[PDB]
């Protein structure tokens, strides 16, 4: 009957770009955005600007690619492309980040904001 058709339509690709670069590297994220239609000249400025800096530069390149797409199923482009950019490693760590967002109803603690703390009242059906 059509089988499961995925459910990450509201991935909201934009907040995981920072938490993702944390586990990613500077050379890894580099070949990523550059190998995703993010303009090679653009990464050129972001390359010499920090030849030896992996602090925030990680979210600088990743974020530059986020504004590129940002629309629908953008999360599928970050994972599928991360594997097509000769990496097959960055898309894994980030895979766990998003998996926690949707699965943050037990191993997380950011749902009852300005209401209480646990989970039950503000919700859709789960207790």
Curated annotation (Swiss-Prot):
Expression across tissues: Isoform 1 and isoform 6 are expressed at equal levels in resting peripheral blood mononuclear cells. After activation there is an increase in isoform 1 and decrease in the levels of isoform 6.
Chain ranges of the Death domain: 14-98
Outcome of swapping residue 41 to D: In ALPS1A; loss of interaction with FADD
Upper lineage: Eukaryota, Metazoa, Chordata, Craniata, Vertebrata
Region (Interaction with CALM): 14-38
Effect of residue 34 to A: Abolished GlcNAcylation by E.coli NleB1
Known outcome of mutating residue 62 to F: In non-Hodgkin lymphoma; somatic mutation
Protein name: Tumor necrosis factor receptor superfamily member 6
Subunit and interaction comment: Component of the death-induced signaling complex (DISC) composed of cell surface receptor FAS/CD95, adapter protein FADD and the CASP8 protease; recruitment of CASP8 to the complex is required for processing of CASP8 into the p18 and p10 subunits. Interacts directly (via DED domain) with NOL3 (via CARD domain); inhibits death-inducing signaling complex (DISC) assembly by inhibiting the increase in FAS-FADD binding induced by FAS activation. Binds DAXX. Interacts with HIPK3. Part of a complex containing HIPK3 and FADD. Binds RIPK1 and FAIM2. Interacts with BABAM2 and FEM1B.
Biological role: Receptor for TNFSF6/FASLG. The adapter molecule FADD recruits caspase CASP8 to the activated receptor. The resulting death-inducing signaling complex (DISC) performs CASP8 proteolytic activation which initiates the subsequent cascade of caspases (aspartate-specific cysteine proteases) mediating apoptosis. FAS-mediated apoptosis may have a role in the induction of peripheral tolerance, in the antigen-stimulated suicide of mature T-cells, or both. The secreted isoforms 2 to 6 block apoptosis (in vitro).
Noted disease: Autoimmune lymphoproliferative syndrome 1A: A disorder of apoptosis that manifests in early childhood and results in the accumulation of autoreactive lymphocytes. It is characterized by non-malignant lymphadenopathy with hepatosplenomegaly, and autoimmune hemolytic anemia, thrombocytopenia and neutropenia.
């Amino acid at each position: 009957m059509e089988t499961v058709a995925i459910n990450l339509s509201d991935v909201d690709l934009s907040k995981y770009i920072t938490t993702i670069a944390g586990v990613m590297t500077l050379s890894q994220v580099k070949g990523f955005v550059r190998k995703n239609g993010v303009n090679e000249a653009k990464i050129d400025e972001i390359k010499n600007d920090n030849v030896q800096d992996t602090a925030e530069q990680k979210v600088q390149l990743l974020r530059n690619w986020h504004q590129l797409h940002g629309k629908k199923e953008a999360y599928d482009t970050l994972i599928k492309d991360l594997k097509k950019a000769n990496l097959c490693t960055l898309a894994e760590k980030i895979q766990t980040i998003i998996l926690k967002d949707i699965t943050s109803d037990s191993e997380n603690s950011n749902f009852r904001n300005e209401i209480q703390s646990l989970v039950l009242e503000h919700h859709h059906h789960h207790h």
